[PDB]
Amino acid sequence: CPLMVKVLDAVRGSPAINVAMHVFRKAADDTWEPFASGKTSESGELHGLTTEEEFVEGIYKVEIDTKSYWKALGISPFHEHAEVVFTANDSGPRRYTIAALLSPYSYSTTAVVTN
Amino acid sequence: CPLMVKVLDAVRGSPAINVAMHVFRKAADDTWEPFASGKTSESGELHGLTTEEEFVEGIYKVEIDTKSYWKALGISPFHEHAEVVFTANDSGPRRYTIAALLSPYSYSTTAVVTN
Amino acid sequence: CPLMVKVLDAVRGSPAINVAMHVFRKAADDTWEPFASGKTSESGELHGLTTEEEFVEGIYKVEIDTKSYWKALGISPFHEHAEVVFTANDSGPRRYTIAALLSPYSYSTTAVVTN
Amino acid sequence: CPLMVKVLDAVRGSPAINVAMHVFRKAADDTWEPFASGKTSESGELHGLTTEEEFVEGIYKVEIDTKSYWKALGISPFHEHAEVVFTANDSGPRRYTIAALLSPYSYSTTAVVTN
Numbered sequence A, B, C, D: 001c002p003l004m005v006k007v008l009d010a011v012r013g014s015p016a017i018n019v020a021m022h023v024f025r026k027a028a029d030d031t032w033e034p035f036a037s038g039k040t041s042e043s044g045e046l047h048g049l050t051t052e053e054e055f056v057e058g059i060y061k062v063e064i065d066t067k068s069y070w071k072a073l074g075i076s077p078f079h080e081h082a083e084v085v086f087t088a089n090d091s092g093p094r095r096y097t098i099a100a101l102l103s104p105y106s107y108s109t110t111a112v113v114t115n
Ligand SMILES: O=C1C[C@H](c2cc(Cl)c(O)c(Cl)c2)Oc2cc(O)cc(O)c21
Pocket: A106, A107, B006, B008, B097, B099, B100, B101, B107, B108, B109, B110, B112, C006, C008, C097, C099, C100, C101, C108, C109, C110, C112
């Protein structure tokens, strides 16, 4: 599993469940092309986004639909979504965990990169 | 000052000085049109981005060039930039401070809305 | 102002107003003696904690009563308080801002040291 | 596993490995009594701190020795340690994941509480 995303809710102290997200990869014409998508499970995790052969060098963007998550909870959030943009696999294949911690008016994101 | 941006550096415990950023506003055709830009000051703050008359309701994106900041310090960064996408809604007199705390492999952002 | 504390609320997107906190300094006998205290203002800031003559090198603890803050808003919090324990070292003229961003089940803190 | 701690390094984008920590529980005489301790593994995780029968209602403190972690990496950090203080099991047994993300001048902590 070369790319996994974990999302937590800082208000309820719980995984952020059923959070949608879309992964895009920058194309040659400098447009964002759809690469993968999914929703977080009961543990707040999204696995199986991609495979090692498909996940090539490039610039990728992970768009986490945080607005829809807060609104299904009755809260009106500040952000429309949380975006994470990074270059992947520039020095060879790595495993990437993108983690995000969400509040109505704030979020934090970090990456764990393993070889 | 209806919109201000403050950037801090979590590695050096200081304001993030000379950080470039661009502000975009969403267009009806689903494209980001340039709205404002600048570079943070010695206090890590960017003021005078916009005026009360120009800052209307809508979806705005702040793209902070974190990669150039870390490269200038000699530190290998994870993200291409830090993006903050938010809705500005008119409900009472609101001033927005967008604040961001930066690390090479992580960032956090929050909004301080006040009257 | 050699030491200032700023507290923000990540749920309401505002400064954390009327937050009580105590500052302790480590004693030779490994006990925390009271040093200063106060409550954050409408800007979420607590100024005038100490003077340059009193703020000597040492280990200091800032204990922020986050539990009372969340209870006042009607929100069930995880932490009893937020604690920030740090060394103040003399190397050039240093002013310390301790900043904290609060959520019910999470908090983040950073130091902004400047000249 | 009713209490687990996960620690990440925001500068290197990696688990924080071999981070020591000490868990204390508040006693009747309002002193902190030693409850459990360990070091994070290669994945940045500390499991096996306690058992469900031993982990009773009370106020617990988790002291993560962040200073020693940064110094074994050649960095001089701001904080002496990261402390997390919370009431556990007040409404019956829960499972607790305390997570921390570390920078030299900053850290964030959050809790996931499951039933
Ligand atoms: O801890 C802080 C405080 C920091 C801040 C500092 C100062 Cl001095 C200030 O005036 C304002 Cl508005 C904000 O903002 C943050 C943004 C963030 O995403 C996570 C954080 O932990 C913080």
